[PDB]
């Protein structure tokens, strides 16, 4: 069954990049929106857009640099079978700081670097590199 939408989101991104797809659509959510907000801000996708009213469809415009893909690697960390929570000291550095770790905190979803500057940790959603 569809037990996990966030890994479905990441997988549709990953396969879109490998297929050289321009845009990727999926059923929207409040969290999938907050993550695409982060991925646009950090520069991995160009733009996101949610359309529709009763069942909204989130469309992501992917980003390609020099022909090849921007998102080299994207991985799910916390899963329904195994949740991962970290403190602010034990936040990870993806690719020695080059990649990011999308973290859900009490003050919303942010990157790991802003979580450290905020002085608070949370749930590690994904490693994006």
């Amino acid at each position: 069954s569809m037990q996990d939408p966030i890994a479905d989101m990441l997988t549709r991104i990953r396969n879109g990049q490998a297929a050289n797809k321009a845009a990727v659509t999926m059923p929207s959510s409040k969290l999938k929106v907050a993550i695409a907000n982060v991925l646009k801000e950090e520069g991995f996708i160009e733009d996101f857009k949610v359309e529709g009213d009763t069942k909204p469809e989130l469309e992501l415009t992917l980003k390609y640099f020099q022909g090849k893909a921007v998102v080299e690697s994207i991985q799910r960390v916390s899963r329904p079978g195994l949740r991962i929570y970290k403190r602010k000291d034990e936040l990870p550095k993806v690719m020695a700081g080059l990649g990011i770790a999308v973290v859900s905190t009490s003050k919303g979803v942010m990157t790991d670097r802003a979580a450290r500057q905020a002085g608070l940790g949370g749930e590690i959603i994904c490693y994006v590199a």
Binding site: G43, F44, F65, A96, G97, L98
Partner: protein, 156 residues
């Protein structure tokens, strides 16, 4: 100039009607003391001919590696066919902590400070391919900055 190291020689065979025909293989790696590295695999009836064919192919098919000062930039992994390979940037003067063929390829790569580990099969051909693939797909802060469309300082 381009420092050249042979990693391993090996005697192979080929059975015919008369009997066994022996031959020699040579695995060489070249490098400029910087990110320009390249390997070769030659084979002949004789060992100096095999090293010469290997150095010939290695001097071409070089690959460029975005180094840091003397080390890597982020912990990278490389696979080829039997050999998952982990390597990690290290502090100054900790040395090349690496196994077998990876020491030679990083020495001619001009790296000097790594913490490496070769899991799986340690066949030198595949592990040197796995290191070449790991260093080749290791990316700089400039390349990720131009890619994400931000500055290096916005990447930190």
């Amino acid at each position: 100039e381009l420092q050249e190291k042979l990693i391993a020689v090996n005697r192979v065979s080929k059975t015919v009607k008369g009997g066994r025909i022996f031959s020699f293989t040579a695995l060489t790696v070249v490098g400029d003391g910087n990110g320009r590295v390249g390997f070769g695999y030659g084979k002949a009836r004789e060992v100096p001919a095999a090293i010469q064919k290997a150095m010939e192919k290695a001097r071409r098919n070089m690959i460029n590696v975005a180094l840091n000062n003397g080390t890597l930039q982020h912990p990278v992994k490389g696979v080829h066919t039997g050999s998952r390979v982990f390597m990690q940037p290290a502090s100054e003067g900790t040395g090349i902590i690496a196994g077998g063929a990876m020491r030679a390829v990083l020495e001619v790569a001009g790296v000097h400070n790594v913490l490496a580990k070769a899991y799986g099969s340690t066949n030198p051909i595949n592990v040197v391919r796995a290191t070449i693939d790991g260093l080749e797909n290791m990316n700089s802060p400039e390349m990720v900055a131009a890619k994400r469309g931000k500055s290096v300082e916005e990447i930190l």
